[PDB]
Amino acid sequence: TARAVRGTKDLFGKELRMHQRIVATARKVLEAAGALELVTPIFEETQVFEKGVGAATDIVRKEMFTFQDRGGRSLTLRPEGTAAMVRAYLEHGMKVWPQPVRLWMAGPMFRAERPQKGRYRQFHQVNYEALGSENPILDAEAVVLLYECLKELGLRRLKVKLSSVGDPEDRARYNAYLREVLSPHREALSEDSKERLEENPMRILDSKSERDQALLKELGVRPMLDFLGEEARAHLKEVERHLERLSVPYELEPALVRGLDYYVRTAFEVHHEEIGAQSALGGGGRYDGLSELLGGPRVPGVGFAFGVERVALALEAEGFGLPEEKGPDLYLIPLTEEAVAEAFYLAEALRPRLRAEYALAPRKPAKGLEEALKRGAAFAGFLGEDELRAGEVTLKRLATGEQVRLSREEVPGYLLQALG
Amino acid sequence: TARAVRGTKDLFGKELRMHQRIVATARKVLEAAGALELVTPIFEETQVFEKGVGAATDIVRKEMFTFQDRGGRSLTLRPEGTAAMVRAYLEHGMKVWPQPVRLWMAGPMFRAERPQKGRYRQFHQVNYEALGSENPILDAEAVVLLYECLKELGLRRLKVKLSSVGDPEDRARYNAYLREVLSPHREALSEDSKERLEENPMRILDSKSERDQALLKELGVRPMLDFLGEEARAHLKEVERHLERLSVPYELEPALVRGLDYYVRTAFEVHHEEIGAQSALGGGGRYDGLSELLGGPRVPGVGFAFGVERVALALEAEGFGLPEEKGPDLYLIPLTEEAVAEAFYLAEALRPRLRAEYALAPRKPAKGLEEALKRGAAFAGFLGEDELRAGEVTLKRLATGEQVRLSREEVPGYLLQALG
Ligand SMILES: Nc1ncnc2c1ncn2[C@@H]1O[C@H](COP(=O)([O-])OC(=O)[C@@H]([NH3+])Cc2c[nH]cn2)[C@@H](O)[C@H]1O
Ligand SMILES: Nc1ncnc2c1ncn2[C@@H]1O[C@H](COP(=O)([O-])OC(=O)[C@@H]([NH3+])Cc2c[nH]cn2)[C@@H](O)[C@H]1O
């Protein structure tokens, strides 16, 4: 009856392997930069996400799998990693390790939103963090690292997008501006936008429908960029300077609306055309102050996170495939009932250095050979009355048909030199 | 303010690495046996665990982190893997694959129980499964595989415990027996046991408190073993025969009541008497019928699962340690403010083939050298005015103190041949 809940799925075969390759590569580039692996629990006290992600965001307001611990305390299934990483930084007094403290991990994230192509309820993302410094070099580095992770995978058609939100103050002022300009024309907005106009109006910029877009154009709504505080623009230029020097092709966006409210200054996202909607492979930005929201000292930080699934789609789109599932090195086929147990014993002697499988019932040579082929076995091994009594085994390389009769002892050696 | 919820913790450093080693080894032995990796979602429809694990077990009754879908469906945080593996088997129609279908994975499990030493609310376990056959060879194999995973890790002081719970009929008869013997003495049972007496009385055997144990002893409650039917007894002997042949040292336990109700016939556990309470490194058994509980055809199956944390404790107990975390190949130290950015640029040119780190502020040679040593860097690199203008870098192997001045171009080559 039961099925895997909509939005989640079982990972196996090629799909699983691709995920493992993605994380493998990310592990290399990130750790090369001095990043330390740190894995946080699947759930945190609900507050860590409420206060951190911001009580006004969609995530916090209606996309968090939150439940109560038996007795008391409200816990929530981690929807994003940053807040957690900061929580960990505080808890372990990482503030005393040599700065900056770079952390990374790869794991599942849970968002209670209606699934569609690209939007899963349970997805997996690689997360990078650089805590303890305001220096714009880390911001550039963050962007470069994300860019490299996808680059190393073989992806070529990426679109990097940089921008800044200035700061909470600048953010507030832009919002007020949008309200003053849009409110008198409120009646021309899409129902969706009309709501967004109340809390965090910026969203109306990144909304759909022609109604909104045409209006924004005629009204001559000026970019968030024009509202950046000076020091903010200085910092952003530093980042650009570094990116340009490192030859990282990017496009400066008029405004990047990131789904999380803890962002301050730097904001970026890498996209891929070959995905349709949800072209965002990954995203990130600076988030100073978050630590304080969780009740800790001021700890500056930058970082990113990319969806492994999205990246997988991108790779597939660009014609990147994976090679066939390897079969057993040897598949033992019992010709007599007494042989089945003996096949098992032989198999165990070959393991784990050699992958040896066997049938659990006696069968005709042709049939067992059929199954060995059916399992992509390199060698087929026959165990009948003759070999059992002789303490030998009849091996047969399936690719050529070459057959050899040898003692049980030689089998490991023969197979290894013939396949290694 | 916030902390990692009690029962969970952040995995990093040596602790994290040990877990990775444990899973690494398990992956080898299991896949050598022909096991395929299959990862199920963190949560399933609450029913999968209610019906599967059995509505009478502690797990289902009061240890499941269950919550509601953002729109109805009751979901539960996976407390154990078998039921899920079976659910997956059914869903993907694995029944049409060549039998038996062996599956494995490693991941977090969540149990809402009060934590103590060894009992975490979020733990991780390696899970093995063999579906599609009743043949006792798989049961022996299962025990051998679990034994091998721990053996390969270097563990020597293990205690394998084998037993059986019989068939549904035998199971029923033993229950009736327990009721008849215990009911007239019902008043001497722990509140917990009094409930268990109603459905699946066997649990009262594996309960805690002195109240229950002393009573069971004086009442002379006979082991589940004495109630095995003919066929069950036959099957168990087959397993023993195989284990004995493979020289797997085990002890036949009188009553090995397992913590799950889906078990039928074979039941085993491996323990280590150096972890204190909760010595069970791992456990498993046969569970035919479970598939049917989930509304599917009859699918026989055997398997096990061991707690990575417990295994880690065991290894530690046996004096198994982990070596030193590798440091950066090169640590660039800026001597001027203009140098910091240049250090970053140089580092990025060396990455990812070479692990290059750097300081984010100018400092005295001696100080930067100390930091390079602190970080376990192989080579220290100086970037002062001279080298900046000369397009060179001053490298110094922290080991021999050998200092070299060379152009930025030669650096990658020099470092690689001197460390590879
Ligand atoms: N529903 C979904 N289905 C599939 N994939 C998804 C889904 N939602 C998010 N992702 C993936 O996670 C990536 C980053 O998500 P985010 O932009 O919310 O960032 C963050 O989470 C921040 N914590 C990043 C960060 C780290 N430090 C600073 N910022 C997206 O590019 C996307 O590929
Ligand atoms: N609270 C805890 N804290 C830390 N470690 C824990 C905790 N609870 C369980 N474990 C670990 O998981 C192992 C097996 O647990 P289980 O007896 O429920 O089995 C099963 O789950 C079965 N599904 C195994 C199986 C597979 N196929 C058939 N049977 C234990 O021996 C222990 O190492």
Swiss-Prot record, chains A, B:
A Pfam family hit: HGTP_anticodon
EC number: 6.1.1.21
A biological-process GO annotation: histidyl-tRNA aminoacylation
GO cellular component: cytoplasm
Keyword annotations of the record: Aminoacyl-tRNA synthetase, ATP-binding, Cytoplasm, Ligase, Nucleotide-binding, Protein biosynthesis
Phylogenetic lineage: Bacteria, Thermotogati, Deinococcota, Deinococci, Thermales
Gene Ontology molecular function: ATP binding; histidine-tRNA ligase activity
Protein name in the entry: Histidine--tRNA ligase
HAMAP family membership: His_tRNA_synth
Organism: Thermus thermophilus (strain ATCC 27634 / DSM 579 / HB8)
Reactions catalysed according to its record: tRNA(His) + L-histidine + ATP = L-histidyl-tRNA(His) + AMP + diphosphate + H(+)
